[PDB]
Amino acid sequence: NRSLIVTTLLEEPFVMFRKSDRTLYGNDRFEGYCIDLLKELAHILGFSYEIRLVEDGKYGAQDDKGQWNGMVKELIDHKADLAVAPLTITHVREKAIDFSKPFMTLGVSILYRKGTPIDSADDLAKQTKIEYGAVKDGATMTFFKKSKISTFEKMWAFMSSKPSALVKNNEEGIQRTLTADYALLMESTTIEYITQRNCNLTQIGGLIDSKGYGIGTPMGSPYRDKITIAILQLQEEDKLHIMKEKWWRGSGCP
Numbered sequence: 259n260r261s262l263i264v265t266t267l268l269e270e271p272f273v274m275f276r277k278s279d280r281t282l283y284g285n286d287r288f289e290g291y292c293i294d295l296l297k298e299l300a301h302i303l304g305f306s307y308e309i310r311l312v313e314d315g316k317y318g319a320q321d322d323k324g325q326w327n328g329m330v331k332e333l334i335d336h337k338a339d340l341a342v343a344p345l346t347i348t349h350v351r352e353k354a355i356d357f358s359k360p361f362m363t364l365g366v367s368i369l370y371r372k373g374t375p376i377d378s379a380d381d382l383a384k385q386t387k388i389e390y391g392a393v394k395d396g397a398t399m400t401f402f403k404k405s406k407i408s409t410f411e412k413m414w415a416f417m418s419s420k421p422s423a424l425v426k427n428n429e430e431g432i433q434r435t436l437t438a439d440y441a442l443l444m445e446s447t448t449i450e451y452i453t454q455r456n457c458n459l460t461q462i463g464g465l466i467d468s469k470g471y472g473i474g475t476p477m478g479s480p481y482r483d484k485i486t487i488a489i490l491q492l493q494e495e496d497k498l499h500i501m502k503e504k505w506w507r508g509s510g511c512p
């Protein structure tokens with residue numbers, strides 16, 4: 259019976275600082291796909307909220323002893339009621355927090371330079387001249403680290419051997435792809451956002467897996483199912499479609 263604490267994280271085009279000449283404060287600072295989603299959900303469910311950025315700026319990963327960080331940890335410690343962000347639904351996280359039904363589907367894939375013979379992840383694993391990596395303590399890093407597939411196990415060996423291969427966030431990864439001979443293992447949504455704005459980059463191959471983003475809540479929260487119902491309502495009303503198209507408009511690359 260009070261406002262909800264919504265934890266999220268700066269990530270284009272999901273959550274961003276609004277551009278304005280006036281000094282903005284509070285929730286009015288933020289814009290993006292997940293901000294629109296949060297507004298729709300708050301309207302359907304009828305609750306007010308306060309948006310807070312994660313301290314460590316990470317999504318969530320487990321260390322050796324099993325301790326979590328990032329938004330996942332924020333939910334575990336009950337520091338936030340909802341995690342409204344591109345939080346990837348993974349079976350590993352499902353045992354620590356609860357996810358709503360997905361509001362967007364995606365998969366792991368490769369971001370790399372255009373015009374290059376490379377066309378798959380195995381091409382990255384079978385050579386060592388072209389460096390590759392992923393975001394630190396993310397769903398992708400956990401995917402390669404806990405993968406039992408031979409190729410992905412070798413790739414995880416390569417990423418883990420180079421401390422510079424794992425980047426802090428998508429930003430550093432994209433810059434690294436632009437400056438060095440480096441391919442970035444990331445999620446297909448971000449790739450789609452980038453390749454429509456940067457015509458020299460492209461996606462290599464298809465989706466290495468298939469999963470979705472969901473709203474995170476502490477385990478056993480009564481708002482998980484309510485948010486699922488709201489997401490289903492928005493899908494029937496076709497609003498997630500027009501939101502996605504709203505924030506994924508591309509300048510266009512010929």
Ligand SMILES: O=C(O)C1=NO[C@H]2CN[C@H](C(=O)O)[C@@H]12
Pocket residue numbers: 317318344345346393395396397398399428443444445
């Ligand atoms: O791990 C990745 O490839 C990711 N890219 O951006 C973030 C979106 N969700 C993933 C997560 O929940 O960790 C992060």
Ligand SMILES: [Zn+2]
Pocket residue numbers: 301
């Ligand atoms: Zn209405």
Ligand SMILES: [Zn+2]
Pocket residue numbers: 336476
């Ligand atoms: Zn709680």
Ligand SMILES: [Zn+2]
Pocket residue numbers: 499503
């Ligand atoms: Zn459309």
